[PDB]
Amino acid sequence: MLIERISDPKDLKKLLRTRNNVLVLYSKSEVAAENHLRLLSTVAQAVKGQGTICWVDCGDAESRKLCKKMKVDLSPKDKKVELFHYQDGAFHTEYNRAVTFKSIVAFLKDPKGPPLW
């Protein structure tokens, strides 16, 4: 399924309030996002009803403010995108496992209950 693009902070705010398992792809540019978007479209289909995936083009001047609000760091030269996971309306973690269909699907289906302490 299509990965929808968000630019307006109010729209991300609404998404995070209404969906409890959200992956946001923050990209340096539309071109930088291409390969990730191709894969994520298939992941989104596989997790329909369980997870929501969207993207923000931080290269877009009108989206820069949103990327800053969300604490995105795309400053490193070898980093094209950042994948952030939001659980129950708040930032949970940067995605840090393999960027593959099976891995991302399993991540979105895995319970992440409270820390052991």
Numbering used by the authors: 28 to 144
Give passages from the manuscript.
We were able to obtain crystals of the N-terminal non-catalytic domain (residues 29–150) with crystals appearing in 1–2 days. The structure shows a typical thioredoxin-like fold containing a five-stranded central β-sheet in the β1˜ββ3˜ββ2˜ββ4˜ββ5 arrangement; all the strands are parallel except for strand β4. The domain does not possess the catalytic CxxC motif but contains three cysteine residues. The walls of the pocket are formed by the aliphatic parts of Glu31, Asp38, Lys41 and Arg46 while the hydrophobic side chains of Ile30, Ile33, Leu42 and Cys81 occupy the base of the cavity. The surface in PDIR is highly positively charged due to the presence of conserved lysine and arginine residues: Lys37, Lys40, Lys92, Lys95, Lys96 and Arg44.
Human protein disulfide isomerase-related (PDIR) protein, also known as PDIA5, was originally identified from a human placental cDNA library. Interestingly, replacement of the non-catalytic domain of PDIR with the substrate-binding b'domain of PDIA1 increases the chaperone activity of PDIR to PDIA1 levels, but decreases oxidative refolding of α1-antitrypsin. This suggests that in a fashion analogous to other PDI proteins, the non-catalytic domain of PDIR plays a key role in binding substrates and chaperone partners.
